């Protein structure tokens, strides 16, 4: 696993072409995330 950039705790991927995309994030330590909810689902075929 890599390291956070010096002086930072994570990286934010700010969307820069697709105006509708939300942000994505990266942490380099597993202890910086807790999996609160397990969601079970199906994607639905559009009508």
């Amino acid at each position: 696993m890599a390291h956070s950039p010096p002086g930072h705790h994570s990286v934010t991927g700010r969307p820069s072409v697709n105006g509708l995309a939300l942000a994505e994030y990266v942490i380099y330590r597993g202890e910086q995330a807790y999996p609160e909810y397990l969601i079970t689902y199906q994607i639905m075929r559009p009508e």
């Binding site: 930072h8 700010r14 820069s16 942490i27 807790y34 609160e36 689902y41």
Partner: protein
């Protein structure tokens, strides 16, 4: 040490988690290749993941980040999709769950768009799709996402196409 508690569809906590799932769906530049063609989900179950050791692991690190950032954990709720969800909920996140080839290096990736994390549920680029039909757009097979508490602390901003 992990137990899974079901939330009733009537519990406002179920309802707010569902709403974040559904409202953060978007169209993807791949036309649905990785994650399938859909505008919304059918939610079958939402479970609270409880593990005291993993939680204390999380909050210990949270206080360290916080103390390095004027008492600001910069905590978010974000989605994660992975073939390793079952190992994650039992043993916690670690290096085996990292995206070695990710655009921001080998770390653990999270999304505000649920539909983004959906693209990783069957692997990188959707892998070969569902186990049963080999269908990246399977409408039948049950999928699982995690909705995660993530400490971002001081985050390096990357502008990115």
């Amino acid at each position: 040490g992990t137990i899974l508690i079901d939330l009733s569809p009537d519990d406002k906590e179920f309802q707010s988690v569902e709403e974040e799932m559904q409202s953060t769906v978007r169209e993807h530049r791949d036309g649905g290749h990785a994650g399938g063609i859909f505008n919304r989900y059918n939610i079958l179950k939402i479970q609270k993941v409880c593990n005291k050791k993993l939680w204390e692991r999380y909050t210990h690190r949270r206080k360290e980040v916080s103390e390095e950032n004027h008492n600001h954990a910069n905590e978010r709720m974000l989605f994660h999709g992975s073939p390793f969800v079952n190992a994650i909920i039992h043993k916690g996140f670690d290096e085996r769950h990292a995206y070695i080839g990710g655009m921001f290096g080998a770390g653990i990736y999270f999304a505000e768009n649920s539909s983004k994390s959906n693209q990783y549920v069957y692997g990188i680029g959707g892998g070969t799709g569902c186990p049963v039909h080999k269908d990246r757009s399977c409408y039948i097979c049950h999928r699982q996402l995690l909705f995660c508490r993530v400490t971002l602390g001081k985050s390096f901003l990357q502008f990115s196409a």
